Structure 1
């Protein structure tokens, strides 16, 4: 089925993966150099062999398209994928007056009742981002994140490049250009960043009316991360196409380091013993055509009848 390329990837890193200890204490198995191909005309590549929450992919992607870098938008949609990046700087500030929270994510896994200490201080940080504007703009805004690097790159002489907006015009007036590229990698910010972009750089392609997108991901997390990653991009391709009045073609995923954290082995193995069902379909509001102004309800997923979710501890 459509998601086969993903499953073949895991069956692969298991079989051929060189053991590679890393940044965190949880070790991995990793490979260098992989490419996946998904024909978007056979259905939106959302996994059926495991329940991936589509809703969160939308909430995040539209955040990106909006040039947004403030977590509030996410919290205001129940999305909590970037909390830790901001909360981190909040526990560091000489304004924050509460518990230790030193490299917290790890203590919450070896969790004494301190997990509730964490989720407690998190609950307040979240409420204060929603309701207190001043707090939201100060500690909610990440600054360097996809939304801005895509749609607000800063030049040497004080301005801001809307990379995506520009490339979209290029697709429209120069669809065959071999330069339809957007990058999230900036050599000047990378030496000090927390999480330098994993989804490093992407390229569009137009042929016989069909849009195709290749994504270079220097880092991947096969069990937890990849299923989402595939989705944001299959989705981003459709949006780009919807706007450009183009049909949809393929999504070619490229990997630098693709890995399986050692404590996801069993879960991934158990997933491999699941036969996939027919892939879902996507419905993009046919009246709206300028995706930047798109909102949640302009994206629909049909026939997503996945198997249940697979609980797997986060790697830290």
Structure 2
């Protein structure tokens, strides 16, 4: 997408070389922001083929409050294998924090349900937020949350959402993260009888790994295609009831996929 490709160019033009924990090396910039008008089309990258089945299943997984890969395995999704333990556990990552953030008084807060209630009864609120950044549990997590904090906003009957991503693997992760959130926005909007607005992406440490340079320039040499369209074939009684098959993406015609290694 224009924005995504423009981001890649920026990191290449302004990036600074950094030694990273994975000892792979990154080219990075700090602070960036882009907006996707969800009414223009579903923001799924076309300059390379993306795996929709993996994106959807991960999101349903998060929504279920799950943090074990069994579910992802049942559906042949292996994007999380490298970080799971012998038992398939990732620790209290996304799913747990979203559905059951533990307070100090022994309670657990379901942030998704809370946000849903706000959108329906207090869409004007200035604090419709979900955070995965649980400082007190960070140490039990296989990996600290990358997409860490998100906020919803309503105006003119449209639902917008802004995500703050503390660390971003531009080539590999970003396309996934973007599609995932836009998907969540459509689902929330459908549950609240709202129209979809903008998805705003804000990044902290935004980088390209050293071993993704050729893939990046290959991609950059391509012209984006018309954005695909998302069709939801049903209206479940709750945001927790969606199924993989309720979704249909139409008119997705991307360029060929580009394989790249992930840094552990």
Q: Output the TM-score relative to the length of structure 2.
A: 0.97
RMSD: 1.2
Query: Residue in 2 aligned with 1:11?
Result: 9
Once residues 209 and 149 of structure 1 are traced to their aligned partners in structure 2, the CA distance between those partners, rounded to angstroms, is: 28
Give, in angstroms, the shift of residue 192 of structure 1. 5.1
Once residues 251 and 239 of structure 2 are traced to their aligned partners in structure 1, the CA distance between those partners, rounded to angstroms, is: 23
Equivalent residue runs for 1:230-269 within 5 Å: 230-269=178-217
Query: Residue in 1 aligned with 2:33?
Result: 35
Which structure dedicates a bigger proportion of its chain to strand?
2
Query: Residue in 2 aligned with 1:271?
Result: 219
In structure 1, the residue corresponding to 2:9 is in which secondary structure?
Answer: helix
In 1, are the aligned partners of 2:91 and 2:142 still within 8 Å (CA)? no
Once residues 46 and 200 of structure 1 are traced to their aligned partners in structure 2, the CA distance between those partners, rounded to angstroms, is: 21
Q: 21-30 vs 249-258, which deviates more?
A: 21-30
Cα distance per residue 1:236-283 (max 9 Å; x no partner): 111110101100010000000000001111111111111111100001
- What 5-or-longer segments of structure 2 have no aligned partner? none
Query: Residue in 2 aligned with 1:24?
Result: 22
Give, in angstroms, the shift of residue 313 of structure 1. 2.1
Alignment size in residue pairs: 264
Query: Residue in 2 aligned with 1:208?
Result: 156
In 1, are the aligned partners of 2:123 and 2:153 still within 8 Å (CA)? yes
Greater C-alpha Rg: 1
Once residues 188 and 288 of structure 1 are traced to their aligned partners in structure 2, the CA distance between those partners, rounded to angstroms, is: 34
Give, in angstroms, the shift of residue 191 of structure 1. 4.1
Query: Residue in 2 aligned with 1:99?
Result: none
2:81 corresponds, among 72, 78, 83, to 83
Once residues 139 and 67 of structure 2 are traced to their aligned partners in structure 1, the CA distance between those partners, rounded to angstroms, is: 20
1:296 corresponds, among 244, 248, 257, to 244
Give, in angstroms, the shift of residue 289 of structure 1. 4.7
In structure 1, the residue corresponding to 2:54 is in which secondary structure?
Answer: helix
In 2, are the aligned partners of 1:242 and 1:289 still within 8 Å (CA)? no
Equivalent residue runs for 1:215-230 within 5 Å: 215-230=163-178
